[PDB]
């Protein structure tokens, strides 16, 4: 079980960070 898919899930995770950063930036600008 190479479980190489769990390396793939790390790739997806990283993406989700980059997305959360941008979502936070966009929401914060409209707030205040």
């Amino acid at each position: 079980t190479e479980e190489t898919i769990t390396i793939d899930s790390i790739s997806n995770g990283i993406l989700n960070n980059l997305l959360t950063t941008l979502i936070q930036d966009i929401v914060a600008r409209e707030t205040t």
């Binding site: 790739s11 990283i14 993406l15 997305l19 941008l22 979502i23 929401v27 914060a28 409209e30 707030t31």
Partner: protein, 86 residues
């Protein structure tokens, strides 16, 4: 001990930043950013509060769902190049 080890990480830092740049381009090109702005104001109208944390929870979960299919795969491919490097 590992002078060259130090060299590798600067290439990665340049790539991760590289990945973050290209992702913003796809979403912005798609007007995805323009739709998220509209979504934030819609949630500010729906909810009395204009707080960042309270507004973030309503807007963020859906926004993650909204990213286009093509953007996911392409960025994931690019993230794979970066990940495979190390």
């Amino acid at each position: 001990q590992l002078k060259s080890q130090i060299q590798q990480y600067l290439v990665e830092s340049g790539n991760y930043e590289l990945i973050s740049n290209e992702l913003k381009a796809r979403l912005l090109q798609e007007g995805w950013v323009d739709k998220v702005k509209d979504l934030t104001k819609s949630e500010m109208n729906i909810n009395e509060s204009t707080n960042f944390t309270q507004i973030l929870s309503t807007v963020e979960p859906k926004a993650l769902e909204m990213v286009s299919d093509s953007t996911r795969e392409t960025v994931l491919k690019q993230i794979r190049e970066f990940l495979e490097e190390i």
